[PDB]
Write a protein that binds this ligand. Structure first.
Ligand SMILES: [Ca+2]
Ligand SMILES: [Ca+2]
Ligand SMILES: [Ca+2]
Ligand SMILES: [Ca+2]
Ligand SMILES: [Ca+2]
Length: 79
C-alpha cells in the first residue's frame, strides 16, 4: 500500500494535463490519445521530466506511444 498506485498515477496525469490546457483535472479524458488533449511538444518534454522526478522512470518514445492514453500510460508506468 506504500508504493505509488495506478489511481495515483492517473490522477497525477489528469492534474498535469488540466494545468497545461487550462481545464479541471476531473474533466480530462483518460481514454483519448494524449496527442489529442491539447498538449504541445514543449508540454511533452516538461511532463516527461516531471514523470522522471515522480517515479524515477525515463519514459521512452516506444513505451509512451504504445500506451498512448492517460489510463494505459499510468498502468504501464506503475505496472
Ligand atoms: Ca498550454
Ligand atoms: Ca481555464
Ligand atoms: Ca473512458
Ligand atoms: Ca531530476
Ligand atoms: Ca521497467
Amino acid at each position: 500500500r506504500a508504493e505509488l498506485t495506478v489511481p495515483e498515477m492517473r490522477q497525477w496525469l489528469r492534474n498535469w494535463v488540466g494545468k497545461a490546457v487550462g481545464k479541471a483535472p476531473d474533466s480530462i479524458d483518460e481514454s483519448v490519445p494524449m496527442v489529442e488533449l491539447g498538449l504541445s511538444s514543449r508540454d511533452a518534454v516538461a511532463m516527461a521530466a516531471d514523470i522522471e522526478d515522480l517515479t524515477g522512470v525515463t519514459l521512452s518514445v516506444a513505451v509512451a506511444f504504445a500506451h498512448p492514453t492517460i489510463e494505459s500510460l499510468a498502468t504501464r508506468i506503475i505496472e
